[PDB]
């Protein structure tokens, strides 16, 4: 829900980037 | 110390992004490259985070600065909980911070914008405190932070 989010999509934006 | 140069850099950062989501301009030539640079990818990040979570979002209701450090303080505890502090995560705080301001400006009737100044350091409070660690060790924001998401 919001920590997941958090979690998932700032992780992936670090992979990412 | 070198603590007082990233705590004030840190706040400067979190009312710079406060700004720009209020759509306010703030003085001198605009804003820092590394201020652009992370409001840039915030706001990336921060609309990614909204559409995950539509069905959700609209249940969440912020009614004060005071409820919004509740949930601040809670969700970034949550988040955090497992250890794990990489720039992604960072950019996520501010993210977040952009939601809070939104839900708080949205409910209220009467937006008060000199008190949503609060909001700003209790973020830079949590980011320097959790994370201020990881950030001298990584890099920095000028070498750290600018020259991945730049």
Same mark, same amino acid.
């Given at each position: 829900?919001? *920590?997941?989010?958090? &979690? &998932?999509?700032?992780?992936?934006?670090?992979? *990412?980037? | 110390?070198?603590?007082?140069?990233? =705590?004030?850099?840190?706040?400067?950062?979190?009312?710079?992004?406060?700004?720009?989501?209020?759509?306010?301009?703030?003085? !001198?030539? !605009?804003?820092?490259?590394?201020?652009?640079?992370?409001?840039?990818?915030?706001?990336?990040?921060?609309?990614?985070?909204?559409?995950?979570?539509?069905?959700?979002?609209?249940?969440?209701?912020?009614?004060?600065?005071?409820?919004?450090?509740?949930?601040?303080?809670?969700?970034?505890?949550?988040?955090?909980?497992?250890?794990?502090?990489?720039?992604?995560?960072?950019?996520?705080?501010?993210?977040?911070? %952009?939601?809070?301001?939104?839900?708080?400006?949205?409910?209220? /009737?009467?937006?008060?914008?000199?008190?949503?100044?609060?909001?700003?350091?209790?973020?830079?409070? =949590? /980011?320097?405190?959790?994370? !201020?660690?990881? /950030?001298?060790?990584? %890099? %920095?924001?000028?070498? !750290?932070?600018?020259?991945? =998401?730049?």
């Amino acid at each position: 829900x919001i *920590a997941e989010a958090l &979690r &998932r999509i700032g992780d992936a934006f670090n992979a *990412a980037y | 110390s070198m603590t007082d140069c990233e =705590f004030g850099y840190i706040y400067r950062l979190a009312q710079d992004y406060l700004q720009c989501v209020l759509q306010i301009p703030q003085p !001198g030539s !605009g804003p820092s490259k590394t201020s652009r640079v992370l409001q840039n990818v915030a706001f990336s990040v921060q609309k990614e985070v909204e559409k995950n979570l539509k069905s959700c979002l609209d249940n969440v209701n912020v009614v004060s600065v005071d409820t919004a450090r509740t949930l601040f303080n809670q969700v970034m505890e949550k988040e955090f909980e497992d250890g794990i502090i990489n720039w992604g995560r960072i950019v996520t705080i501010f993210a977040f911070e %952009g939601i809070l301001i939104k839900k708080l400006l949205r409910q209220q /009737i009467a937006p008060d914008v000199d008190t949503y100044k609060e909001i700003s350091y209790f973020v830079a409070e =949590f /980011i320097m405190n959790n994370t !201020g660690e990881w /950030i001298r060790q990584n %890099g %920095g924001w000028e070498n !750290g932070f600018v020259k991945k =998401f730049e």
